[PDB]
Design a protein around this ligand. Structure first.
Ligand SMILES: [Kr]
Ligand SMILES: [Kr]
Ligand SMILES: [Kr]
Ligand SMILES: [Kr]
Ligand SMILES: [Kr]
Ligand SMILES: [Kr]
Ligand SMILES: [Kr]
Ligand SMILES: [Kr]
Ligand SMILES: [Kr]
Ligand SMILES: [Kr]
Ligand SMILES: [Kr]
Ligand SMILES: [Kr]
Length: 291
Protein backbone atom coordinates (compact mmCIF):
# COMPACT_ATOMS: atom_id res chain seq x y z
CA UNK A 1 0.00 0.00 0.00
CA UNK A 2 2.90 2.35 0.71
CA UNK A 3 3.99 3.78 -2.62
CA UNK A 4 7.28 2.64 -4.14
CA UNK A 5 7.42 5.00 -7.11
CA UNK A 6 9.31 8.28 -7.38
CA UNK A 7 7.14 10.39 -9.71
CA UNK A 8 9.13 13.61 -9.50
CA UNK A 9 10.84 15.32 -12.41
CA UNK A 10 14.54 15.92 -11.73
CA UNK A 11 15.77 19.43 -11.06
CA UNK A 12 19.45 20.35 -10.91
CA UNK A 13 21.33 23.37 -9.63
CA UNK A 14 25.04 24.16 -9.65
CA UNK A 15 26.41 24.41 -6.10
CA UNK A 16 30.10 25.13 -5.39
CA UNK A 17 31.04 23.65 -8.77
CA UNK A 18 28.93 20.49 -8.44
CA UNK A 19 25.43 19.60 -9.57
CA UNK A 20 22.84 18.90 -6.88
CA UNK A 21 19.53 17.17 -7.57
CA UNK A 22 16.27 18.20 -5.96
CA UNK A 23 12.51 17.62 -6.09
CA UNK A 24 10.55 20.83 -6.67
CA UNK A 25 6.73 20.65 -6.80
CA UNK A 26 3.73 22.61 -5.56
CA UNK A 27 2.78 26.25 -6.11
CA UNK A 28 5.62 28.53 -7.10
CA UNK A 29 5.03 31.20 -4.45
CA UNK A 30 4.25 31.26 -0.76
CA UNK A 31 6.57 29.87 1.86
CA UNK A 32 8.49 26.82 0.60
CA UNK A 33 8.78 23.62 2.63
CA UNK A 34 12.33 22.22 2.58
CA UNK A 35 12.63 18.46 3.21
CA UNK A 36 16.04 17.21 4.41
CA UNK A 37 16.98 13.51 4.45
CA UNK A 38 19.85 11.81 6.28
CA UNK A 39 21.90 8.60 6.13
CA UNK A 40 21.79 6.55 3.80
CA UNK A 41 18.71 7.94 2.11
CA UNK A 42 17.78 10.68 -0.39
CA UNK A 43 14.72 12.63 -1.43
CA UNK A 44 13.23 9.18 -2.12
CA UNK A 45 12.56 9.03 1.65
CA UNK A 46 10.00 11.85 1.29
CA UNK A 47 8.18 10.45 -1.74
CA UNK A 48 4.98 9.54 0.12
CA UNK A 49 4.98 12.65 2.33
CA UNK A 50 5.46 15.41 -0.27
CA UNK A 51 2.13 14.66 -2.07
CA UNK A 52 0.22 15.66 1.08
CA UNK A 53 1.97 19.06 1.18
CA UNK A 54 2.36 19.90 -2.52
CA UNK A 55 -1.33 20.86 -3.05
CA UNK A 56 -0.81 23.88 -0.78
CA UNK A 57 2.93 24.63 -0.61
CA UNK A 58 6.10 24.53 -2.66
CA UNK A 59 8.02 21.38 -1.71
CA UNK A 60 11.81 21.30 -2.19
CA UNK A 61 13.70 18.10 -1.38
CA UNK A 62 17.43 18.12 -2.18
CA UNK A 63 19.75 15.15 -2.30
CA UNK A 64 22.72 15.93 -0.07
CA UNK A 65 26.08 16.15 -1.81
CA UNK A 66 27.40 12.68 -2.58
CA UNK A 67 23.90 11.20 -2.16
CA UNK A 68 20.87 10.44 -4.29
CA UNK A 69 21.22 11.94 -7.77
CA UNK A 70 23.60 14.70 -6.66
CA UNK A 71 27.21 14.79 -7.82
CA UNK A 72 30.05 13.01 -6.02
CA UNK A 73 32.92 15.49 -5.62
CA UNK A 74 36.22 14.58 -3.99
CA UNK A 75 35.32 15.72 -0.48
CA UNK A 76 36.15 14.57 3.00
CA UNK A 77 32.33 14.29 3.44
CA UNK A 78 32.56 15.55 7.02
CA UNK A 79 29.55 17.34 8.50
CA UNK A 80 31.04 20.74 7.63
CA UNK A 81 31.12 19.75 3.94
CA UNK A 82 27.39 19.08 4.04
CA UNK A 83 26.84 22.38 5.85
CA UNK A 84 28.67 24.25 3.10
CA UNK A 85 26.80 22.57 0.25
CA UNK A 86 23.35 22.90 1.83
CA UNK A 87 24.01 26.58 2.66
CA UNK A 88 24.96 27.21 -0.96
CA UNK A 89 22.01 25.16 -2.25
CA UNK A 90 19.53 27.30 -0.30
CA UNK A 91 21.12 30.52 -1.59
CA UNK A 92 21.30 29.18 -5.16
CA UNK A 93 17.53 28.65 -5.09
CA UNK A 94 16.99 32.12 -3.63
CA UNK A 95 14.99 30.85 -0.69
CA UNK A 96 14.16 33.54 1.85
CA UNK A 97 11.82 32.18 4.53
CA UNK A 98 11.27 28.42 4.76
CA UNK A 99 9.47 25.72 6.71
CA UNK A 100 11.82 22.82 7.53
CA UNK A 101 10.84 19.14 7.47
CA UNK A 102 13.87 17.24 8.70
CA UNK A 103 15.17 13.80 9.69
CA UNK A 104 18.48 12.28 11.01
CA UNK A 105 21.53 14.14 9.59
CA UNK A 106 19.08 16.31 7.66
CA UNK A 107 17.87 17.49 11.05
CA UNK A 108 21.40 18.36 12.20
CA UNK A 109 21.74 20.37 8.98
CA UNK A 110 18.30 21.94 9.35
CA UNK A 111 18.60 22.85 13.03
CA UNK A 112 22.12 24.21 12.53
CA UNK A 113 20.86 26.35 9.65
CA UNK A 114 17.88 27.52 11.70
CA UNK A 115 20.10 28.56 14.62
CA UNK A 116 22.19 30.67 12.23
CA UNK A 117 19.17 32.01 10.32
CA UNK A 118 16.39 32.20 12.93
CA UNK A 119 14.41 35.00 11.24
CA UNK A 120 14.09 32.82 8.12
CA UNK A 121 12.51 29.72 9.70
CA UNK A 122 8.73 29.81 10.00
CA UNK A 123 8.30 26.30 11.44
CA UNK A 124 10.16 23.04 11.93
CA UNK A 125 8.70 19.54 11.62
CA UNK A 126 11.14 16.89 12.73
CA UNK A 127 11.45 13.22 13.59
CA UNK A 128 14.21 10.84 14.69
CA UNK A 129 16.64 13.73 14.81
CA UNK A 130 20.21 14.13 15.96
CA UNK A 131 20.57 15.09 19.62
CA UNK A 132 23.53 14.56 21.98
CA UNK A 133 23.19 10.96 23.17
CA UNK A 134 24.61 10.86 26.73
CA UNK A 135 25.66 7.19 26.86
CA UNK A 136 25.82 4.10 24.69
CA UNK A 137 23.20 2.69 27.09
CA UNK A 138 20.73 5.09 25.48
CA UNK A 139 21.51 3.53 22.09
CA UNK A 140 19.15 0.63 21.24
CA UNK A 141 20.67 -2.65 22.35
CA UNK A 142 20.01 -4.45 19.06
CA UNK A 143 22.14 -1.88 17.18
CA UNK A 144 24.73 -0.95 19.82
CA UNK A 145 27.54 -3.34 18.83
CA UNK A 146 27.03 -2.46 15.15
CA UNK A 147 27.31 1.30 15.59
CA UNK A 148 30.30 0.90 17.91
CA UNK A 149 31.89 -1.19 15.14
CA UNK A 150 31.10 1.50 12.56
CA UNK A 151 33.11 3.88 14.77
CA UNK A 152 35.98 1.36 15.24
CA UNK A 153 39.10 1.89 13.09
CA UNK A 154 39.31 -0.36 10.01
CA UNK A 155 36.32 -2.47 11.09
CA UNK A 156 33.82 0.30 10.37
CA UNK A 157 35.09 0.83 6.82
CA UNK A 158 35.03 -2.90 6.11
CA UNK A 159 31.38 -3.02 7.18
CA UNK A 160 30.10 0.17 5.55
CA UNK A 161 32.40 0.67 2.52
CA UNK A 162 33.28 -2.90 1.57
CA UNK A 163 30.09 -4.73 2.62
CA UNK A 164 27.55 -1.86 2.28
CA UNK A 165 26.24 -2.52 5.80
CA UNK A 166 24.37 0.78 6.09
CA UNK A 167 22.22 0.05 3.03
CA UNK A 168 21.87 -3.72 3.32
CA UNK A 169 21.72 -3.96 7.12
CA UNK A 170 20.81 -0.75 8.92
CA UNK A 171 18.20 0.60 6.50
CA UNK A 172 15.84 -2.43 6.54
CA UNK A 173 16.55 -3.10 10.23
CA UNK A 174 15.39 0.42 11.14
CA UNK A 175 11.99 0.08 9.40
CA UNK A 176 9.36 -1.94 11.25
CA UNK A 177 7.52 -3.14 8.16
CA UNK A 178 9.53 -4.98 5.47
CA UNK A 179 11.04 -2.85 2.73
CA UNK A 180 10.37 -4.16 -0.76
CA UNK A 181 13.01 -4.97 -3.35
CA UNK A 182 11.89 -2.01 -5.48
CA UNK A 183 12.39 0.31 -2.51
CA UNK A 184 15.77 -1.23 -1.66
CA UNK A 185 16.89 -0.79 -5.26
CA UNK A 186 16.03 2.92 -5.12
CA UNK A 187 18.13 3.26 -1.96
CA UNK A 188 20.94 1.14 -3.43
CA UNK A 189 21.35 3.07 -6.69
CA UNK A 190 23.65 5.92 -5.47
CA UNK A 191 26.00 3.49 -3.71
CA UNK A 192 26.43 0.54 -6.10
CA UNK A 193 30.23 1.06 -6.07
CA UNK A 194 32.29 1.07 -2.85
CA UNK A 195 34.15 4.23 -3.94
CA UNK A 196 30.82 6.08 -3.58
CA UNK A 197 30.22 5.09 0.05
CA UNK A 198 32.42 7.53 2.00
CA UNK A 199 29.43 9.63 3.21
CA UNK A 200 27.82 6.48 4.59
CA UNK A 201 30.82 5.85 6.83
CA UNK A 202 31.52 9.48 7.78
CA UNK A 203 28.01 10.01 9.15
CA UNK A 204 28.06 7.36 11.94
CA UNK A 205 31.55 8.53 12.84
CA UNK A 206 30.10 12.01 13.45
CA UNK A 207 27.14 10.95 15.64
CA UNK A 208 27.37 12.79 18.98
CA UNK A 209 27.42 9.93 21.49
CA UNK A 210 28.98 9.95 24.98
CA UNK A 211 30.66 13.30 24.32
CA UNK A 212 32.39 12.37 21.06
CA UNK A 213 33.32 13.65 18.61
CA UNK A 214 33.65 16.84 20.64
CA UNK A 215 33.15 19.22 17.70
CA UNK A 216 29.82 17.72 16.63
CA UNK A 217 28.73 17.34 20.26
CA UNK A 218 29.20 21.06 20.82
CA UNK A 219 27.50 22.02 17.54
CA UNK A 220 24.44 19.87 18.30
CA UNK A 221 24.28 21.08 21.91
CA UNK A 222 24.28 24.62 20.52
CA UNK A 223 21.32 24.12 18.23
CA UNK A 224 19.38 22.21 20.90
CA UNK A 225 19.94 25.17 23.22
CA UNK A 226 18.65 27.44 20.46
CA UNK A 227 15.62 25.20 19.91
CA UNK A 228 14.71 25.24 23.61
CA UNK A 229 14.57 29.07 23.63
CA UNK A 230 12.99 29.57 20.22
CA UNK A 231 9.29 30.43 19.81
CA UNK A 232 9.24 28.88 16.32
CA UNK A 233 6.31 26.47 15.76
CA UNK A 234 7.53 22.89 16.12
CA UNK A 235 6.02 19.53 15.15
CA UNK A 236 7.59 16.27 16.38
CA UNK A 237 6.72 12.82 15.05
CA UNK A 238 7.77 9.88 17.20
CA UNK A 239 7.31 6.12 17.23
CA UNK A 240 7.90 3.18 19.49
CA UNK A 241 10.47 1.99 20.30
CA UNK A 242 12.27 4.60 18.18
CA UNK A 243 16.05 4.76 17.77
CA UNK A 244 17.39 8.28 18.23
CA UNK A 245 14.20 9.53 19.91
CA UNK A 246 12.79 6.88 22.28
CA UNK A 247 9.42 7.56 23.93
CA UNK A 248 11.00 9.00 27.11
CA UNK A 249 12.88 11.51 24.97
CA UNK A 250 9.73 12.43 23.04
CA UNK A 251 8.06 13.02 26.41
CA UNK A 252 10.96 15.20 27.58
CA UNK A 253 10.72 17.30 24.41
CA UNK A 254 6.95 17.64 24.85
CA UNK A 255 7.65 19.19 28.27
CA UNK A 256 10.65 21.38 27.39
CA UNK A 257 10.32 22.75 23.88
CA UNK A 258 8.22 25.89 23.31
CA UNK A 259 5.32 25.81 20.87
CA UNK A 260 5.58 22.06 20.20
CA UNK A 261 2.91 19.72 18.85
CA UNK A 262 3.70 16.00 19.09
CA UNK A 263 2.29 13.17 16.97
CA UNK A 264 2.74 9.51 17.91
CA UNK A 265 2.91 7.44 14.72
CA UNK A 266 2.65 3.97 16.22
CA UNK A 267 5.34 1.34 15.66
CA UNK A 268 8.53 2.91 14.42
CA UNK A 269 12.29 2.62 14.62
CA UNK A 270 14.31 5.24 12.71
CA UNK A 271 12.91 5.72 9.16
CA UNK A 272 9.44 6.65 10.38
CA UNK A 273 8.54 7.91 6.89
CA UNK A 274 8.59 4.28 5.74
CA UNK A 275 6.24 3.05 8.49
CA UNK A 276 3.50 5.74 8.54
CA UNK A 277 3.91 8.24 5.70
CA UNK A 278 0.18 8.96 5.52
CA UNK A 279 -0.02 10.21 9.10
CA UNK A 280 3.20 12.20 8.82
CA UNK A 281 2.24 13.85 5.53
CA UNK A 282 -1.36 14.56 6.51
CA UNK A 283 -0.37 16.02 9.87
CA UNK A 284 2.22 18.31 8.30
CA UNK A 285 -0.42 19.48 5.83
CA UNK A 286 -2.86 20.22 8.67
CA UNK A 287 -0.20 22.07 10.69
CA UNK A 288 1.10 24.39 7.96
CA UNK A 289 -1.93 26.76 7.88
CA UNK A 290 -1.43 27.74 11.53
CA UNK A 291 2.04 29.08 10.64
KR1 LIG B 1 20.43 5.52 10.68
KR1 LIG C 1 29.25 13.55 8.31
KR1 LIG D 1 21.60 20.20 -0.08
KR1 LIG E 1 18.04 24.39 6.19
KR1 LIG F 1 22.90 10.96 17.74
KR1 LIG G 1 19.71 6.79 21.33
KR1 LIG H 1 20.69 -2.91 13.36
KR1 LIG I 1 34.96 5.21 -0.15
KR1 LIG J 1 20.22 6.26 13.52
KR1 LIG K 1 8.98 10.13 30.67
KR1 LIG L 1 5.26 12.87 23.49
KR1 LIG M 1 11.62 18.08 30.08
Amino acid sequence: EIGTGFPFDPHYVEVLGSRMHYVDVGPRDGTPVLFLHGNPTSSYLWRNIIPHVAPSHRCIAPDLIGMGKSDKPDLDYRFDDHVRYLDAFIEALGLEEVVLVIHDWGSALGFHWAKRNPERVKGIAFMEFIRPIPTWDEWPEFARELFQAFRTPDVGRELIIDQNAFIEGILPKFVVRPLTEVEMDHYREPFLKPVWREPLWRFPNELPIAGEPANIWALVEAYMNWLHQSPVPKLLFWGTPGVLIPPAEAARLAESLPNLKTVFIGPGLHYLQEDNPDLIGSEIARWLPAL
